Design an enzyme around this catalytic site. Structure first.
Site, PDB file in Angstrom:
ATOM      1  N   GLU A  71     -10.152   1.412   7.439  1.00  0.00           N
ATOM      2  CA  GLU A  71     -10.724   0.907   6.320  1.00  0.00           C
ATOM      3  C   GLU A  71     -10.252  -0.613   4.986  1.00  0.00           C
ATOM      4  O   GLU A  71     -10.942  -0.823   5.022  1.00  0.00           O
ATOM      5  CB  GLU A  71      -9.377   1.894   4.935  1.00  0.00           C
ATOM      6  CG  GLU A  71      -9.815   2.683   3.886  1.00  0.00           C
ATOM      7  CD  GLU A  71      -9.874   1.583   2.975  1.00  0.00           C
ATOM      8  OE1 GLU A  71     -10.702   1.059   1.684  1.00  0.00           O
ATOM      9  OE2 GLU A  71      -8.503   0.279   2.633  1.00  0.00           O
TER      10      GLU A  71
ATOM     11  N   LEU B 249       0.492  -0.931   0.161  1.00  0.00           N
ATOM     12  CA  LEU B 249       0.217   0.316   0.040  1.00  0.00           C
ATOM     13  C   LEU B 249       0.817   1.059   0.511  1.00  0.00           C
ATOM     14  O   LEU B 249       1.787   1.525   0.985  1.00  0.00           O
ATOM     15  CB  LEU B 249      -0.791  -0.120   1.162  1.00  0.00           C
ATOM     16  CG  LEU B 249      -1.837  -1.267   0.958  1.00  0.00           C
ATOM     17  CD1 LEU B 249      -3.378  -1.247   1.734  1.00  0.00           C
ATOM     18  CD2 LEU B 249      -2.465  -1.449  -0.616  1.00  0.00           C
TER      19      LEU B 249
HETATM   20  N1  LIG Z   1     -10.755  -0.105  -0.277  1.00  0.00           N
HETATM   21  C1  LIG Z   1      -9.826  -0.790   0.311  1.00  0.00           C
HETATM   22  N2  LIG Z   1     -10.102  -2.194  -1.342  1.00  0.00           N
HETATM   23  C2  LIG Z   1      -8.847  -3.054  -1.242  1.00  0.00           C
HETATM   24  N3  LIG Z   1      -9.342  -3.786  -2.587  1.00  0.00           N
HETATM   25  C3  LIG Z   1      -7.986  -3.200  -0.425  1.00  0.00           C
HETATM   26  C4  LIG Z   1      -7.187  -4.045  -0.952  1.00  0.00           C
HETATM   27  C5  LIG Z   1      -6.335  -4.497   0.294  1.00  0.00           C
HETATM   28  C6  LIG Z   1      -5.485  -5.559   0.201  1.00  0.00           C
HETATM   29  N4  LIG Z   1      -5.060  -6.267   0.888  1.00  0.00           N
HETATM   30  C7  LIG Z   1      -3.443  -5.961   1.961  1.00  0.00           C
HETATM   31  C8  LIG Z   1      -2.923  -5.345   0.932  1.00  0.00           C
HETATM   32  C9  LIG Z   1      -1.657  -5.209   0.437  1.00  0.00           C
HETATM   33 CL1  LIG Z   1      -0.962  -4.768   0.115  1.00  0.00          CL
HETATM   34  C10 LIG Z   1      -1.256  -5.235   2.382  1.00  0.00           C
HETATM   35  C11 LIG Z   1      -1.722  -5.641   3.170  1.00  0.00           C
HETATM   36  C12 LIG Z   1      -3.011  -5.697   3.358  1.00  0.00           C
HETATM   37 CL2  LIG Z   1      -4.154  -7.173   4.524  1.00  0.00          CL
HETATM   38  C13 LIG Z   1      -6.532  -3.584   1.308  1.00  0.00           C
HETATM   39  N5  LIG Z   1      -7.254  -2.028   1.520  1.00  0.00           N
HETATM   40  C14 LIG Z   1      -8.290  -2.595   0.859  1.00  0.00           C
HETATM   41  N6  LIG Z   1      -8.762  -1.355   0.644  1.00  0.00           N
END
Ligand SMILES: Nc1nc(N)c2cc(CNc3cc(Cl)ccc3Cl)cnc2n1
Length: 186
Positions: free
Chosen positions: A30, A22
Site C-alpha cells: 500500500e 496510521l
Molecule cells: N494511499 C495512501 N495515501 C497516503 N497519503 C499515504 C501516506 C502515508 C504517509 N507515510 C507514512 C505515514 C505514516 Cl503516518 C507512517 C509511516 C509512513 Cl511511511 C502512507 N501511506 C499512504 N497511503
C-alpha cells in the site's frame, strides 16, 4: 502545471490517523503504491509536487523525508521557513497553488498531490475545478482521531478503472483493502 490530485488511505469509519500514525499496522505494498503514484511523472524533465500540512510532514519517518524524487511543500502559518529537509513553505493551499505558477516552479512541476491531512483535503475537495481523489479503502474499522472528509458523490464520480491502479481486492497483514479513483470537474 499538470493535474491536481488528493491521495489517501482511509478505514471503514473514515479514519486516516491516530496520534500522528496510521490507524492500521504498516501495509508495505500500500505504501509502495502511494510512492509510485505520487512519484511517477508523465512529463520529461519535471517532478511532481507533494503538498502536505505540518502535522502530516512530521508524521513521515525522518528517513523518508523529503519524499524522494518529488518537490516537497509544507503548509503552515506558524512556520516561517520550510522545516528541515522540506523544499517549500506556503501559508495556505491557495497560496501553494499560486506559487506553482511563479518562475521558480512553473516549469519544474508536473502533477500536484495533496497528501494530507484532514483540513487540507477538505479545502481541496470543495474548491471548484478539476480534481481526482485516489482513495485506498481499508475495509475494516480502525480506532482513529483524524478523519477523511465526506466525499460528495453527486460531484465525485468513481471511475470504473484507471491505468496503473489494480481493480481487485488486496490483502496484507490479514487486512483487505482496494484502490479507487474519483474525479470531479466543477
Ligand atoms: N494511499 C495512501 N495515501 C497516503 N497519503 C499515504 C501516506 C502515508 C504517509 N507515510 C507514512 C505515514 C505514516 Cl503516518 C507512517 C509511516 C509512513 Cl511511511 C502512507 N501511506 C499512504 N497511503
Amino acid at each position: 502545471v499538470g493535474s491536481l490530485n488528493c491521495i489517501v488511505a482511509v478505514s471503514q469509519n473514515m479514519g486516516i490517523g491516530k496520534n500522528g500514525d496510521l490507524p492500521w499496522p504498516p501495509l508495505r505494498n500500500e505504501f509502495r503504491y502511494f510512492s509510485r503514484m505520487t512519484t511517477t511523472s508523465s512529463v520529461e524533465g519535471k517532478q511532481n509536487l507533494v503538498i502536505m500540512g505540518k502535522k502530516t510532514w512530521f508524521s513521515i519517518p525522518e528517513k523518508f523525508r523529503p519524499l524522494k524524487g518529488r518537490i516537497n511543500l509544507v503548509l503552515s502559518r506558524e512556520l516561517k521557513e520550510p522545516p528541515q529537509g522540506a523544499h517549500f513553505l506556503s501559508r495556505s493551499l491557495d497560496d501553494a497553488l499560486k506559487l506553482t505558477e511563479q518562475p521558480e516552479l512553473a516549469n519544474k512541476v508536473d502533477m500536484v498531490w495533496i497528501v494530507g491531512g484532514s483540513s487540507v483535503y477538505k479545502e481541496a475537495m470543495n474548491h471548484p475545478g478539476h480534481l481526482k481523489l485516489f482513495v485506498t479503502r481499508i475495509m475494516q474499522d480502525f480506532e482513529s482521531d483524524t478523519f477523511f472528509p465526506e466525499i460528495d458523490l453527486e460531484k465525485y464520480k468513481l471511475l470504473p478503472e484507471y491505468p496503473g491502479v489494480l481493480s481487485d481486492v488486496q490483502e496484507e497483514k490479514g487486512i483487505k483493502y482496494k484502490f479507487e479513483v474519483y474525479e470531479k470537474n466543477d
